Amino acid sequence: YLDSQYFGKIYIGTPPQEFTVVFDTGSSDLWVPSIYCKSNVCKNHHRFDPRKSSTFRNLGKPLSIHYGTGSMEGFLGYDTVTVSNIVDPNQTVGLSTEQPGEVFTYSEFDGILGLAYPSLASEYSVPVFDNMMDRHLVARDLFSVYMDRNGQGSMLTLGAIDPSYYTGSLHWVPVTLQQYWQFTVDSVTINGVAVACVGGCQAILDTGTSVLFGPSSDILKIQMAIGATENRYGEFDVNCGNLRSMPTVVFEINGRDYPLSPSAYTSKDQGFCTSGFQGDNNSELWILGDVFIREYYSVFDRANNRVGLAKAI
């Protein structure tokens, strides 16, 4: 759930040391590799050296996070972190000392900056946006996410909504459980009939994920409804020539329709077209990743515990 290209540069310490991080609405901790991680993966990424920062303070607290295909262990420090033109002082930063796992081998980011609720933060870790809200460094207690449909995009706006990135009106959906950015999806219909999320379901908006995940049974119904066929890689593909005649998949959220066109829910790479839906056999949680967010400019409002959606430019 960390394969999206929703990265950004951040700066930590005095003078600033630069890192690339995935901005992840599916988690809540900030961490980057430290100079004390000596593995190949770490040595060939940016590593924070606390000895070189005059504002660094060691918290005397550990951090350990497990991922599907890896884990990180490290230590926590305070330092100044700059993100999207906001300078965030006295910010807890996780600093890796080990990073086993394929996830880090195959990911271009140095670290992760979580944007979910503090309930998901590790012990002793304070989420970046929480620290910013607490210190009153943002104009409003919300942030906004634009992902450009074509090629690694594009913007994280902290403390504001940027109307230049959407058309039509912003519509709001209440958060149901304040951990992930979680809410109710009412239905998923295709060709005007119920296919998935029948009777409603729980979903999250997850900027860290490239695809759209759902329970396997429901997802298989979607693959069949869109005319996709399973291949030997375990993915589902379609004839690119059929995109013009394929159906829209409609996510209904708080009673309004959020259609995904065939071009939006498939990937086309040198004439090979694959479904952006992926099934999970061990979870009923729908994960609306970049497939969805590329189509819908997304506002994450902590003051009012709600998500705002509008059609992206």
CB of 156 to ligand NAG, least distance (A): 25
Sign of the dihedral through C-alpha 284, 206, 291, 22: negative
Smaller CB distance to ligand NAG: residue 54 or 85?
Answer: 54
Written as six digits, the tokens of 165 are 């990135």
Residues numbered 286 to 305 that lie near ligand NAG (CB under 6 A) are none
Smaller CB distance to ligand NAG: residue 84 or 90?
Answer: 90
Smaller CB distance to ligand NAG: residue 55 or 176?
Answer: 55
Round to whole Å and give the CA distance between 113 and 21. 6
CB of 176 to ligand NAG, least distance (A): 33
Smaller CB distance to ligand NAG: residue 39 or 55?
Answer: 55
Taking CB under 6 A as the rule, does residue 82 contact ligand NAG?
no
CB of 121 to ligand NAG, least distance (A): 17
State the Cα torsion 295-301-304-309 to the nearest 10°. Answer: -10
CB of 55 to ligand NAG, least distance (A): 5
Round to whole Å and give the CA distance between 216 and 223. 10
Catalytic residue among 29, 79, 130, 206: 206
From residue 70, how far is each of 65, 100, 245 by CA, in Å?
Answer: 9, 5, 41
Please identify the residue of the shown chain whose CB is closest to the bound ligand NAG. Answer: 90
Taking CB under 6 A as the rule, does residue 55 contact ligand NAG?
yes
Smaller CB distance to ligand NAG: residue 90 or 254?
Answer: 90
Which residues, in sequence order, are bridge partners of residue 174?
A: 306
Spell out, one character per residue from 158 to 197, where the chain touches ligand NAG: x when CB under 6 A holds, - when not.
----------------------------------------
* Burial (CB count <10 Å: 0-12, 13-18, 19+), residue 79: buried
Written as six digits, the tokens of 110 are 């140095």
Catalytic residue among 24, 29, 130, 218: 24
CB of 244 to ligand NAG, least distance (A): 58
Active site residue 206: yes
Taking CB under 6 A as the rule, does residue 90 contact ligand NAG?
yes
Contact residues: ligand NAG, CB under 6 A: 55, 90
Q: Which residues are catalytic?
A: 24, 206
